[PDB]
């Protein structure tokens, strides 16, 4: 199995970790800040998936500084993961075409 097929895989594993760790850290960072909504594990986990896929929903966002820093790690891990799958699929397609041309 090719490297790119591994990083793709690896990235997907790591993303799942960041989501969970993220849901967990968000709540810790947020409880204590008046009006915060990211304060129960389940909610934060959905908030987590949304952010990783770069989707926003209202004001379902962190209000504390660390909350946001966490938000940034989750967005970047998500955008790095998906773009890495994208790169892996592009190596697969670029390789098959080289075969199709008997190059």
């Amino acid at each position, epitope marked *: 199995s090719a490297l790119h097929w591994r990083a793709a895989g690896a990235a997907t594993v790591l993303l799942v970790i960041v989501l969970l760790a993220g849901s*967990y850290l968000a*709540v*810790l960072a*947020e*409880r*204590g*800040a*008046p*009006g*915060a*909504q990211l*304060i*129960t*594990y*389940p909610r934060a986990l959905w908030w987590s998936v949304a952010t990783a896929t770069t989707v926003g929903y209202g004001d379902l966002y962190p209000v504390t500084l660390w909350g946001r820093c966490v938000a940034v790690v989750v967005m970047v891990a998500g955008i790095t993961s998906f773009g890495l799958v994208t790169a892996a699929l592009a190596t697969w397609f670029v390789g098959r075409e080289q075969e199709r041309r008997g190059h």
Partner: antibody
Amino acid sequence: QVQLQQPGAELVKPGASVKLSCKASGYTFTSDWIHWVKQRPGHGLEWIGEIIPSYGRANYNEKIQKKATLTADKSSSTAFMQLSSLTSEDSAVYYCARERGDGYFAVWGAGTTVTVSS
Amino acid sequence: DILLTQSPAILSVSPGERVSFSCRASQSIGTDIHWYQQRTNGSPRLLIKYASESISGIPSRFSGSGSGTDFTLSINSVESEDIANYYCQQSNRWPFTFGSGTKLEIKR
């Protein structure tokens, strides 16, 4: 079986302080939070603050004055609340409860009746 | 902070009847509200979570309705063991809070 254990009562002199306890049992996670609730005779429930043992970070109700300090002890699964400079207004039953991090108090202690008197 | 308003403070219903306690939030909190029962001298007991999810070990006479800002805790065929104080609590926004409570009173 009884999940949270608290001392039936505690007497304290006006001006003095007191550390209440709340030990646990049964299922316990690193994600669990221990809360503290104050109830004065004839009144309703009042959230005092929370703490997460496996880290030691705690948050308190800001609307009321801070007569408390929360701390825990990983090993013996025991949580503590440090009430200081008490007046008669601090006399009441203080419960501690457990929240799995999903918003509701699943299990409460019997509470500790505190009396501030000379 | 989210304000929880339980009115009336006291409810007088006749044995066997159905009863309905209301809890209103100062703003929309989805279904993030939970009910607790407290009999005289006892500690709070979780009756319903997330406005309508049943807890284990609770008579099927207890149910919950609502979402947004209006919530109802209902009891079918009320009975003596139901005499107590009822509280609602929200977990939509920090800090958590409780309603002032409602006392159940049966007329025999």
